[PDB]
Amino acid sequence: GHMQSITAGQKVISKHKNGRFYQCEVVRLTTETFYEVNFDDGSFSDNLYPEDIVSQDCLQFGPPAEGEVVQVRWTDGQVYGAKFVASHPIQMYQVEFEDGSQLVVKRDDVYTLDEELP
């Protein structure tokens, strides 16, 4: 959604790591910044984290310049040449389940207690 804003301290319903929906509590609203890059073969990634840029220290100095050549460490642990496209912060929701487990989830994966699932 929404319509409904979700706030810290609110009981909501979201999927646990076991893959089923349970009630959980929003413990914090976080901002995660994702980087978008074009790899040298022309494939596109929309969900790098700033630390995945290994040619410069983006956590310390911010994003590369638009179009800047970069090296990126991919999820296979290998390094690839790319060019920086854009960064976009996404508002997210850190939730805690009855068992103490936590997840950081996007708005669309959070439901209020009053609404029909899914």
- Residue spans of the domains in the chain: they are 1-33+87-118, 34-86
Instruction: Provide the token pair at 96.
Output: 């805690």
Q: How far apart are CA 69 and CA 84, in angstroms?
A: 6
| Residue 59, C-beta contacts closer than 8 angstroms, at least 6 positions apart | 50, 51
For this experimental structure, what is the resolution in angstroms? 1.8
Q: Which value, in Å, is the radius of gyration of the alpha carbons in the chain?
A: 17
CATH architecture label of 34-86: Roll (3.10)
Dihedral sign, Cα of residue 73, residue 54, residue 66, residue 105:
positive
Q: How far apart are CA 75 and CA 19, in angstroms?
A: 22
| Residue 48, C-beta contacts closer than 8 angstroms, at least 6 positions apart | 34, 35, 36, 37, 72
Q: How far apart are CA 85 and CA 106, in angstroms?
A: 22
Q: How far apart are CA 98 and CA 10, in angstroms?
A: 14
Class of the domain covering 1-33+87-118: mainly beta
Instruction: Provide the token pair at 34.
Output: 């994702």
Q: How far apart are CA 98 and CA 107, in angstroms?
A: 20
